[PDB]
């Protein structure tokens, strides 16, 4: 029925969404380190 269907997929999407979120936080941290090093990169070229 429509109720248990919604209640089951909501459960599956919550789990799924949490996992997309963690993968993104990871790439956020990697991208963030690239910025640090690109920053530093231009600054040493100024020499």
């Amino acid at each position: 029925n429509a109720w248990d269907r919604t209640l089951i997929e909501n459960g599956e999407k919550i789990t799924s969404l949490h996992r997309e979120v963690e993968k993104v936080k990871l790439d956020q941290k990697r991208l963030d380190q690239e910025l640090d090093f690109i920053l530093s990169q231009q600054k040493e070229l100024e020499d």
Copy 2:
């Protein structure tokens, strides 16, 4: 009480929590984007 109720409620708790976390990684992505825009704008030539 009922398993039905409790699952609804707990999905409720789980969603509110994901909401904050998603607000968090949007703030961060926007922060990242504006830091690059800033780094690029600061590159500024001098040749020579």
Copy 3:
């Protein structure tokens, strides 16, 4: 009615979150692409004169 309406709002919300996450994943992807380009660009530009 409160049960039904919590079921719907839950469904609406989690769906709206997937969309936000998707949108963030797209910006990340574009940002990663942009850094790859910048990295390639600054490799050429100091190979050209340094030190």
